[PDB]
């Protein structure tokens, strides 16, 4: 079942994840009581220039009102003006704006809201397939370091650039603690004369 953090997209490169969910009464409504399934942010249109997204919302609104499927084949003689003429002939603001009310207060919104149906997709990337945490777990046989893999209950790589950032921060103790006590820390005995790890130790 969809939840916060699941990834959705429309057919125009407009991908995004669910940030929050609101119930029926909390969502903004038009005067006919229609409420949206989905509220996306206006700041994704201008710099991305996905005009087809807005055109397709308008065409879908007209098609659902008149009970057919809009033809959105590329390189045809359809125009936004004709779609707006149809929409206005159906008794709606020709540019797809509607007067909507605030769900929390019922007061009208000072701005009008671009509103209509759009075909969205449920992508395979779900948060529940990605969320991973590890306190302690299996280690590798050879290196005795945390294993690799979410499925294997592995650990995350604290690579070289993370070390550079910790060095820039001047956090020496944190770096030593990441690389020793959060990973393959070991104890060895050295010879005070030859300095080789050739010391035979019987601790008991």
């Amino acid at each position: 079942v969809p939840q916060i953090g699941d990834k959705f997209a429309s057919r125009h490169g407009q991908k995004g994840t669910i940030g929050v969910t609101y119930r029926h009464e909390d969502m903004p409504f038009s005067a006919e009581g229609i409420v949206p399934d989905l509220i996306i942010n206006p700041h994704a249109i201008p710099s991305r220039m996905t005009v087809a997204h807005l055109i397709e919302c308008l065409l879908s609104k007209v098609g659902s009102i008149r009970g057919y499927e809009g033809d959105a084949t590329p390189f045809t003689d359809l125009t936004v003006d004709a779609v707006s003429n149809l929409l206005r002939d159906n008794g709606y603001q020709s540019r797809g704006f509607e007067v909507m009310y605030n769900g929390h207060t019922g007061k009208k919104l000072m701005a009008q809201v671009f509103f209509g149906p759009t075909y969205y997709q449920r992508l395979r990337h779900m948060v529940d397939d990605k969320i991973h945490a590890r306190a302690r777990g299996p280690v590798q046989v050879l290196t005795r370091q945390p294993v690799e893999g979410r499925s294997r209950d592995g650990g995350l790589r604290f690579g070289e650039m993370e070390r550079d950032c910790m060095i820039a921060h001047g956090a020496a103790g944190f770096l030593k603690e990441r690389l020793m006590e959060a990973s393959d820390a070991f104890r060895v005995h050295v010879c005070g004369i030859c300095g080789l790890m050739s010391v035979i130790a019987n601790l008991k």
Partner: protein, 49 residues
């Protein structure tokens, strides 16, 4: 394995935006908050807790 290595006590998941969090706050899922841990030495100011 020496310049970089895999470490315990780490987590990873998708990030989301929250207008109602402070600048230096991060929202942590309950499941991760329970999977990860911090070792806290017992003292005479935190023994009841």
């Amino acid at each position: 394995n020496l310049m970089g290595k895999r470490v315990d006590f780490s987590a990873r998941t998708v990030i989301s935006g929250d207008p109602n969090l402070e600048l230096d706050q991060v929202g942590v899922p309950i499941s991760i908050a329970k999977t990860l841990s911090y070792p806290e030495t017992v003292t005479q100011y935190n023994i009841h807790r």
